[PDB]
């Protein structure tokens, strides 16, 4: 990684990838990775394996989808973070687990957890972009409330 925009590409093992400043792309590959966007607007994709994703400050994009395993987002700041899930919104479940938000793809064991979502706004992502539609924070909370009474 460098202060410039980098494309950081892991391998099938457990990799640590730190983007540093600049608007980076982090592709972990298989294995259980640690990905840090740091400063800047970063795109993080843990891919297969159970990954820890730290977008950092700035407006970060997290990818998720079928076969991505159990990944955990640890946010730090930014008013325009996004999760881009390669599935229809009609296949997403939302639940509060402790202080975390858990997002599941129905029919799979792929699960994305936002650590400490419910602690304060700096831990949150602001939009979920599914294949067909976008869901904002008020929308995510309505889904969590609806799904908890399901
Ligand atoms: Ca960066
Ligand atoms: Ca960089
Ligand atoms: Ca890897
Ligand atoms: Ca991985
Ligand atoms: Ca960042
Ligand atoms: Ca961020
Ligand atoms: Ca993963
Ligand atoms: Ca945020
Ligand atoms: Mg700064
Ligand atoms: Mg782990």
Swiss-Prot record:
Record function comment: Bifunctional adenylate cyclase toxin-hemolysin that plays a crucial role in host colonization. It causes whooping cough by acting on mammalian cells by elevating cAMP-concentration and thus disrupts normal cell function.
UniProt PTM: Released in a processed form.
Family: In the N-terminal section; belongs to the adenylyl cyclase class-2 family.
Start and stop residues of the Hemolysin-type calcium-binding repeats: 9-26, 27-44, 45-62, 75-92
Full-sequence portion shown in this chain: 1529 to 1678 of 1706
Protein name: Bifunctional hemolysin/adenylate cyclase
Subcellular location: Secreted
Domains (record comment): The Gly-rich region is probably involved in binding calcium, which is required for target cell-binding or cytolytic activity.
Species in which this protein is naturally found: Bordetella pertussis (strain ATCC 9797 / DSM 5571 / CCUG 30873 / LMG 14455 / NCTC 10739 / 18323)
